[PDB]
Design a protein around this nucleic acid. Structure first.
Lengths: 100, 67, 228, 312, 142
RNA sequence: UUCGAUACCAAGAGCUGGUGUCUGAGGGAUUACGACUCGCGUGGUCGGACAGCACAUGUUAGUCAUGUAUUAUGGUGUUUCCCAACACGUAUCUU
RNA sequence: UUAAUUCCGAUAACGAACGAGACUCUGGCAUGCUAACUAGUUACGCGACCCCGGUCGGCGUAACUUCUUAGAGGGACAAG
């Protein structure tokens, strides 16, 4: 019965909107739910030179891209939370659901 | 290097002139008054405004405030 | 699935997809009044929203252009057939889209309207659209062989700090004239609205608003208002 | 006669904000401060210190606004600026239950006479009352104060199960606990109200505001009786449990009046003059009667509690 | 007798130390070893500071199990000397007299503050054009 | 040395608190219906109140509008899928 | 006077705008909050050893969130 939903997004408050939506769903459908486990954030860091050519004073850009991850566990059959997980899909957040 | 800018000072003088009767000597209560009466968009700005409000009002009693 | 890309490489691949897609649509529909793209990856669908202004032209003849663009984007990016459904949506208040103005000015200047008259014309349209303030720069070879930069500003425009991210909308473009490339830079400072339609919902981080007090009248002597 | 001092209690690091006394343990008080600590005391009435701090009740986030003892003497309910309440036992001072639901700062808390109801006034325009297992029974925001509900107080004479509420919109609101709804408003004040305390015989209520005018309203009727101009701002009011005296904290002094003849019984400034060199004096923040009404405790701004006793 | 357990930590640098105080007889051990065997031995007394000052009379009622991670040698030594001292103050206010804690705190804090208060310093970030935080590469004229 | 309040138990009482019987006042989505886009399919969006009913009908309202079954702009009954007494409503079990 | 055309004062100027500051990211504080078999703890039972205890990154599941993670708020303002 141990279904696991992994919510992954670049935006935090859009991730927290979908996360707080699925817990509201699990609780209003009377299901055992492990709260959202905040897995450590990953910082995709690339540092470039700023100039296209060579002859400017040595200046560097520092581009970052944070990626955030929650996972919520559920003790329930597949098709109930399938109807819940189909509800409230945002353009930003990315969902992956495993069964066992 | 703690010189308050025109933003903090003007906001403090406008808040006192409109709401003298609520603000007092205590910093923490009139932090909460300024929070409610003024839609201030950041927390550090609210604290600096509230800070200068309970400096102006703590000298209004002494006497000749100009601005 | 079997290849099983990491979240890092997957999210960069998602970003590059948008980068190459934005390049493709900008190159083709520059002269059709195209604003931007939005990519909703619906359950076993890829619902690409095209934001335009003149949506009849990005649509084509009985949806010939859309069926054309759906066919090639499916072909290059290797999606399965039917799992790519495009949707043309005209933007309300085109005046406050930096790309719409920058690419329209471009097609006026190469058309044959004067540089000064084009800049003033775009500038007046933006300030009547309701931007807080605008800035149209047209730089390159103007009035001979040595190059100039003409700068047309009206109203308020901020330059430094984070609020530049969500109040100032920018657009840098190139136009093909016979002397060489004329570079265009259009800046639009958006108006603030609590609605969140045409501008951002966050007020400027130093614009302090004060509630004015209700000018009531003090009760002189004790009254009471008994009820039940 | 008069009321005279012996010494001071040193156990707070922030401003003492409120004191709660129990009729069971007269050698024990609780005081709520402007740090995250409620200090329970053990009063020896000796030479070096009148009382020594016996317990430190820690576990809040912000300044503790109100502390209130149970009739048992084995629960001390407290309300703080983090919007939480802490129902605690004084056996060890460990946590039993916590209340959540209030959003902004909780300003004043109060028990029922049967220790079966809680009521809480907050910086949001809401008077929330709770069952004893910390879930919201009812909230009143509709026909309520338009500004902060500073103080809320239950009936000692609960034959009329009433509650009295002084706020920041210059009114006092009387409510029926039958349905928790508005009965009579008390209009007349000229500034936000700090405190409102019910006479121990549960007949009439004294409202102290900024202006520093203590107004006696009636609770038998919805009518005014008289006023007492203390002079300076009245911070906290307290009523004699045996005598017919008012005790009012008129800024840096507490003045006790007689109500039979409207004249000051006694005036209380700590004439140990310390602020003789250019500053405002450390003012009294709250005050509490002991078991009998022979011993007054007064919490002051400079992290001190001064204890007065009626000599004759 | 019942539960009298309290776990309190001490950070000076990236390092951290956590001390499990609980009733018994006097036994203070860091990752198994006694306090005479934690290295370097040059910093013997820096570990004995709270013991030497409070005396064995105050410690002998309870035993403490310290566990450490992060930072380096000096760091973890300032972490453990903080962790056991903080743990005993937290113990002596929660389970015995408040005057007993007031006595301990005033003695420890007035000898040295770092036994209770962590030093808030952390390694500052590097920026381009220099080999460290502030030092810059050699500029050449002519 | 008589006059009125205080530490307690017995005679049941009420109240509050626990628990929960019950109706749904409401609250929501979406799908019914309402539109605007249309490349004709959708897409966007009002999200049940705005939406229409069949003269079926819950009540009557100037007695004058009407041109005296009559639809006034009585404006409220029929009626989709969920959570529902802070809607402090009340059953039962107890303080 | 300030890090600053940063303010106060003087004052035929008054009231404002951009840059400065505010803003954003990060650094440090929470024995408070919501949560953790992809983090760990304290106990507990078995198992090994030294003489009831000592150590256990040996094993295994009842409480939990101090330790680790990342969300929300609180916090500092020349306030005393």
């Amino acid at each position: 019965h141990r279904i696991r939903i992994t919510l992954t997004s670049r935006n935090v408050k859009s991730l927290e909107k979908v996360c707080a939506d699925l817990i509201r769903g699990a609780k209003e459908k009377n299901l055992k739910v492990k709260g959202p486990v905040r897995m450590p954030t990953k910082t995709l860091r690339i540092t470039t030179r700023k100039t296209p050519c060579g002859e400017g004073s040595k200046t560097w850009d520092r581009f970052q891209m944070r990626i955030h991850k929650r996972l919520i566990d559920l003790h329930s059959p597949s098709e109930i939370v399938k109807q819940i997980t189909s509800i409230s899909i945002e353009p930003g957040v990315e969902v992956e659901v495993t069964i066992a | 290097g703690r010189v308050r800018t025109k933003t903090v000072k003007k906001a403090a003088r406008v808040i006192i002139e409109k709401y003298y009767t609520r603000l007092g000597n205590d910093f923490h209560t009139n932090k909460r008054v300024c929070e409610e009466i003024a839609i201030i968009p950041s927390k550090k700005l609210r604290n600096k405004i509230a800070g200068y409000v309970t400096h102006l009002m703590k000298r209004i009693q002494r006497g000749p405030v100009r601005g | 699935m079997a290849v099983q890309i990491s979240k890092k490489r997957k999210f960069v691949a998602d970003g590059i997809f948008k980068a190459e897609l934005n390049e493709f649509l900008t190159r083709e529909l520059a002269e059709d009044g195209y604003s931007g793209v939005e990519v909703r990856v619906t359950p076993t669908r890829t619902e690409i929203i095209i934001l335009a202004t003149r949506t009849q032209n990005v649509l084509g003849e009985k949806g010939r252009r859309i069926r054309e663009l759906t066919a090639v984007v499916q072909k290059r990016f290797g999606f399965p057939e039917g799992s790519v459904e495009l949707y043309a949506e005209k933007v309300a208040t085109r005046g406050l889209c930096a790309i719409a103005q920058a690419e329209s000015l471009r097609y006026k200047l190469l058309g044959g309207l004067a540089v000064r008259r084009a800049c003033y014309g775009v500038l007046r349209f933006i300030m009547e659209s309701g931007a807080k303030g605008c800035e149209v720069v047209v730089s390159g070879k103007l009035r001979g062989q040595r190059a100039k930069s003409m700068k047309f500003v009206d109203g308020l425009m901020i330059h430094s700090g984070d609020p530049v991210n969500y109040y100032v909308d920018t657009a840098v473009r190139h136009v093909l004239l016979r002397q060489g490339v004329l570079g265009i830079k259009v800046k639009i400072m958006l108006p603030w609205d609590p609605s969140g339609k045409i501008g951002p919902k966050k007020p400027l981080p130093d614009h302090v608003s004060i509630v004015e007090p209700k000018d009531e009248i003090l009760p002189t002597t004790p009254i009471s208002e008994q009820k039940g | 006669e008069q009321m005279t001092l012996r010494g001071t209690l040193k156990g707070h690091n922030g401003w003492v904000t409120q004191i709660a006394t129990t009729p069971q343990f007269p050698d024990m008080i609780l005081s709520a401060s402007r740090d995250k600590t409620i200090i329970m005391w053990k009063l020896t009435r000796d030479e070096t210190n009148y009382g020594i701090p016996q317990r430190a009740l820690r576990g809040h986030s912000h300044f503790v606004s109100d502390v209130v003892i149970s009739s048992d003497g084995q629960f001390a309910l407290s309300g703080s600026w983090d919007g939480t309440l802490r129902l605690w036992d004084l056996t060890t001072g460990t946590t039993t239950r916590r209340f959540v639901g209030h959003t902004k700062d909780v300003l004043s808390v109060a028990f029922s006479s049967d220790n079966r109801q809680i009521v809480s006034g907050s910086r949001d325009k809401t008077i929330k009352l709770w069952n004893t297992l910390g879930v919201c029974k009812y909230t009143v925001q509709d026909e309520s104060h338009s500004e902060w509900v500073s103080c809320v107080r239950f009936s000692p004479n609960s034959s009329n199960p009433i509650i009295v509420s002084c706020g920041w919109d210059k009114l006092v609101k009387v409510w029926n606990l039958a349905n928790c709804k508005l009965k009579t408003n008390h209009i007349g004040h000229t500034g936000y109200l700090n405190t409102v305390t019910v006479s121990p015989d549960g007949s009439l209520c004294a409202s102290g505001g900024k202006d520093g005018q203590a107004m006696l309203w009636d609770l038998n009727e919805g009518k005014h009786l008289y006023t007492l101009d203390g002079g300076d701002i009245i911070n906290a009011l307290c009523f004699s449990p045996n005598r017919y005296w008012l005790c009012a904290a008129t800024g840096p002094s507490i003045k006790i009046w007689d109500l039979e003849g409207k004249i000051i019984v006694d005036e209380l400034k700590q004439e140990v003059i310390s602020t003789s060199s250019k500053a405002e004096p450390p003012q009294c923040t709250s005050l509490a009667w002991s078991a009998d009404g022979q011993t007054l405790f007064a919490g002051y701004t400079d992290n001190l509690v001064r204890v007065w006793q009626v000599t004759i | 007798g019942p539960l009298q357990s309290v776990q309190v930590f001490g950070r000076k640098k990236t390092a951290t130390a956590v001390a499990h105080c609980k009733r018994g007889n006097g036994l203070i051990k860091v990752n198994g070893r006694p306090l005479e065997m934690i290295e370097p031995r040059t910093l013997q007394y820096k570990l004995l500071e709270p013991v030497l000052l409070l005396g064995k009379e105050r410690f002998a009622g309870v035993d403490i199990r310290v566990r450490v991670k992060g930072g380096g040698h000096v760091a973890q030594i300032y972490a453990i000397r903080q962790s056991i001292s903080k743990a005993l103050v937290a113990y002596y206010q929660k389970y015995v007299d408040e005057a007993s804690k007031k006595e301990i705190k005033d003695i420890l804090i007035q000898y040295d503050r770092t036994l209770l208060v962590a030093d808030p310093r952390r390694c500052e970030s590097k920026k381009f054009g220099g080999p460290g935080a502030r030092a810059r590469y050699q500029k050449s004229y002519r």
